[PDB]
């Protein structure tokens, strides 16, 4: 009955897609080939895998996901990997030449040759779907594929499916950390689209996860295998209410209308707790009152921002495991008595709580400690306006001397479109200023 | 019971026939030796239809293998199932036809039909209750078109109250494997329309496109194409040999799909086709068969159904299933595609149900369709026939054998009347 569709675009979306879909198999007890073990049998009335997997009549489980990439060197890793018998051979769509960190190639030139095939799959997955609830698009702001191809794809879904929720998961370019040099360009060209087509767009970055991995997990030199496991646990905690039973469950629409106060303020943050190593949890006891305070410390934020500069606007606490509602209730009123956590005066009630019954599962070969309770915090703050401030400052020094423009205009993109995209984030900056003022 | 006398003429008919008698040998569990090695008793109760009993529990086909050239007879008898055909059923001439209609219909194909008609009359009278005839040939050749259509004329004047079904290989523009075959295609359909009750046009672009987009084979040899033809040939008579919820013999298909005596040109398809990688992933379900059924990509002729309007459509289903999802699906597709059926006949869809699917498969369904878009097949041959006849190209191979030039004038005159009347009932 409850269903979700996951699309992984660009290299960042697909590589996390390898990490989120390996965790989904352990939750439901599905082998990598796509079948359940013969030693144990499930009950008759099981809908736990119905959110993500579709039952084939031959006793085989097929994921409900589409993996689209314009370059073949990443998808061919999946087709030749250990999950080759899991995915559909035709859902794995590949192109010929990549976008080369160019928005004009992924949206105007090369991205228009494949999108007739891409929307064909989404039509097929939705038609087989009995009841559809939303979309889970995974990409990054930086790449030409993650920015160019996402833009014209997601506007076509809003044309096709009218009032279906659409939830991105995007890699924010970090403040001091950036790999490409066209990075201030591609972020501005994405956000011209995601304001009028997205309902909740979650942000993570590489730099804040690095410091979390350095201090909590004591991983001195983290890599891409370490980051994508941590991101994959948050998405499995968000969707945990649609798969399992809970004390009070949150649907996809229920936190969609409880988290955004204004149509142009729809950029929440993701925070997970407790991210701890195996040896530290052996000494430190995990209570309900302690893990909820771990979310609100600035060192545990997965976006490189200072939460103390702005004020909180709306929060959503999503618990798992052996959690009773009495301990949460006294834990929240402890937080509201603190003066350093500043809530806005026009939103007297800001917390929404969801409690589930299944504890988190650790992937063998991993790093995370195996625990009982864990909480994922989704917070809407005004502190991310400073994050958009320094990115526009990066854009203004590129466009002052008209650098890097002749690659963009050589594929079909107009020169003038940078002006409307720049003034949009001018409007988005003062929109956070206009709501943060008091009375 | 109701015995089907298979006929097999030409080189193309021999290779289709060698593949046809291989599939229903797998269906009835008949080894290449000739005995029976099966498990269930549903196979042996109706085995007299296609196989004939001998001593020692040996079943032999009731097939007549005819060709003017002995070259392909050695390849038939040296195949996988080459030791199961009766040695007295190989009627072979000594000299080839050479891709000429007149040589195969008047001079060299005139002496061999006396030996064939001895074999056919012996096998036809040996049946308890004969059901009909079934023939496979090629219109683009000399023996199959020239002499195969002569046997159709001679059989029809001896057993009038029977049924005649042909699986004829219509030619293609880009698979033009003979320079003279518009002469042989035109003169064959002049004989076909008066002496045949059902005609299933089989083309080669239709089969070559399927193996590229649906089966995605990299080397689609003729053994791959002849399996798809033989799959249809066993799926059309599957209720004549097996029990079911709603049976339909060969006469029931001719009654429903032929409203007029000169509208007997069907155009077939087979429902369950998927690549090797898509076997374990796709769930075989009744809407999944019907969705693939009506598409123009799986259909086995070089004519687009959207350029014409359907007259009557029959579907023969196989497998254990439920009648509600069957009966709803071809009623639902009649509702959306209301413009693709003529409005002067209601309820155009024939439903037939069996219980035994083929081996290794759970649900199967064969699509047979009458359509006025088959006029597009006969307009291409007719415009090619006139183009040489203006300049009298290749004519001396024809008028030097006995036939006059007026036979070419009446062959196009009857063929132009067929394309005149298909267009009339479309509008």
């Amino acid at each position: 009955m409850r269903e979700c569709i996951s699309i992984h675009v660009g290299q960042a979306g697909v590589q996390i897609g390898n990490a989120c879909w390996e965790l989904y198999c352990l939750e439901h007890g599905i082998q990598p080939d796509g079948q359940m073990p013969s030693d144990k049998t499930i009950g008759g009335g099981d809908d736990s895998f119905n959110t993500f997997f579709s039952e084939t009549g031959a006793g085989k489980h097929v994921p409900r996901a589409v993996f689209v990439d314009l370059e073949p060197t990443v998808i061919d890793e999946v087709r030749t990997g250990t999950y080759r018998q899991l995915f559909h051979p035709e859902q794995l769509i590949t192109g010929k030449e990549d976008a080369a960190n160019n928005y004009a190639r992924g949206h105007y030139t090369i991205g228009k040759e494949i999108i007739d095939l891409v929307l064909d799959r989404i039509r097929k997955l939705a038609d087989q779907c009995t009841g559809l609830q939303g979309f889970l698009v995974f990409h990054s702001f930086g790449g030409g594929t993650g920015s160019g191809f996402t833009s014209l794809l997601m506007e076509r879904l809003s044309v096709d499916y009218g009032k279906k929720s659409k939830l991105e998961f995007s890699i924010y370019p970090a403040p001091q950390v950036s790999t490409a040099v066209v990075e201030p360009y591609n972020s501005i060209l994405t956000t011209h689209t995601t304001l009028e087509h997205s309902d909740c767009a979650f942000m993570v970055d590489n730099e804040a996860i690095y410091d979390i991995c350095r201090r909590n997990l004591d991983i001195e030199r983290p890599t891409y295998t370490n980051l994508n496991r941590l991101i994959g646990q948050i998405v499995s905690s968000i969707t945990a209410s649609l798969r399992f039973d809970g004390a009070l469950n949150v649907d996809l629409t229920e936190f969609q209308t409880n988290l955004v106060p204004y149509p142009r303020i729809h950029f929440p943050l993701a925070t997970y707790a407790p991210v701890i190593s195996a040896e530290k949890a052996y000494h430190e006891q995990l209570s309900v009152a302690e893990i909820t305070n771990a979310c609100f410390e600035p060192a545990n934020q997965m976006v490189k921002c200072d939460p103390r500069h702005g004020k909180y606007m709306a929060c959503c606490l999503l618990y798992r495991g052996d959690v009773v509602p009495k301990d949460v209730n006294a834990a929240i009123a402890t937080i509201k008595t603190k003066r350093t956590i500043q809530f806005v005066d026009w939103c007297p009630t800001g917390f929404k709580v969801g409690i589930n019954y299944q504890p988190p599962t650790v992937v063998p070969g991993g790093d995370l400690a195996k625990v009982q309770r864990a909480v994922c915090m989704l917070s809407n703050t005004t502190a991310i306006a400073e994050a958009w401030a320094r990115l526009d400052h990066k854009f203004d020094l590129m466009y002052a001397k008209r650098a890097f423009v002749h690659w963009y205009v050589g594929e079909g993109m107009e020169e003038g479109e940078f002006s409307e995209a720049r003034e949009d984030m001018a409007a988005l900056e003062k929109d956070y200023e206009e709501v943060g003022v008091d009375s | 019971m109701r015995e089907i006398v298979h006929l097999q003429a030409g080189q193309c008919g021999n290779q289709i026939g060698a593949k046809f008698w291989e599939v229903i040998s797998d269906e009835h569990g008949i080894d290449p030796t000739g005995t029976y090695h099966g498990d269930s008793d549903l196979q042996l109760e109706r085995i007299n239809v296609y196989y004939n009993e001998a001593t020692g529990g040996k079943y032999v086909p009731r097939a007549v293998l005819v060709d003017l050239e002995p070259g392909t007879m050695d390849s038939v008898r040296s195949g996988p199932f080459g030791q199961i055909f009766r040695p007295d059923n190989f009627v072979f001439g000594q000299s080839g036809a050479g891709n000429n209609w007149a040589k195969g219909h008047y001079t060299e194909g005139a002496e061999l039909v006396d030996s064939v008609l001895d074999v056919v009359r012996k096998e036809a009278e040996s049946c308890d209750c004969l059901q009909g005839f079934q023939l496979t040939h090629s219109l683009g050749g000399g023996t199959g078109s020239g002499m195969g259509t002569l046997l159709i004329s001679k059989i029809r004047e001896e057993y009038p109250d029977r049924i005649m079904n042909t699986f004829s290989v219509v030619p293609s523009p880009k698979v033009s494997d003979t320079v003279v075959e518009p002469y042989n295609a035109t003169l064959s359909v002049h004989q076909l329309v008066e002496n045949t009750d059902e005609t299933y046009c089989i083309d080669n672009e239709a089969l070559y496109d399927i193996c590229f987009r649906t089966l995605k084979l990299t080397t689609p040899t003729y053994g791959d194409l002849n399996h798809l033809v033989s799959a249809t040939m066993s799926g059309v008579t599957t209720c004549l040999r097996f029990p079911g919820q709603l049976n339909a013999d060969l006469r029931k298909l001719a009654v429903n799909m032929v409203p007029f005596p000169r509208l007997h040109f069907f155009m077939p398809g087979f429902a369950p086709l998927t690549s090797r990688g898509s076997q374990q992933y796709r769930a075989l379900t009744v809407p999944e068969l019907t969705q693939q059924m009506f598409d123009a990509k799986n259909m086995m002729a070089a004519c687009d159904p959207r350029h014409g309007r359907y007259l009557t459509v029959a579907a023969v289903f196989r497998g254990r299933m439920s009648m509600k999802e069957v009966d709803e699906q071809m009623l639902n597709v009649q509702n959306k595609n209301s413009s693709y059926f003529v409005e002067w006949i209601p309820n155009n869809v024939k439903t037939a149900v069996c219980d035994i699917p083929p081996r290794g498969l759970k649900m199967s369904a064969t699509f047979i369709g009458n359509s006025t878009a088959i006029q597009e097949l006969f307009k291409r041959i007719s415009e090619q026939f006139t183009a040489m006849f203006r300049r009298k190209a290749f004519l001396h191979w024809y008028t030097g054998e006995g036939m006059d030039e007026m036979e070419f004038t009446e062959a196009e005159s009857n063929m132009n009347d067929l394309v005149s009347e298909y267009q009339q009932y479309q509008d």
């Binding site: 073949p72 | 995605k216 690549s275 090797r276 990688g277």
Partner: peptide
């Protein structure tokens, strides 16, 4: 064998 290099429908060849 066949379909070693990753072009021109290598997946179906590796399957069959």
């Amino acid at each position: 064998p066949r379909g070693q290099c990753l072009l021109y429908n290598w997946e179906e060849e590796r399957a069959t």
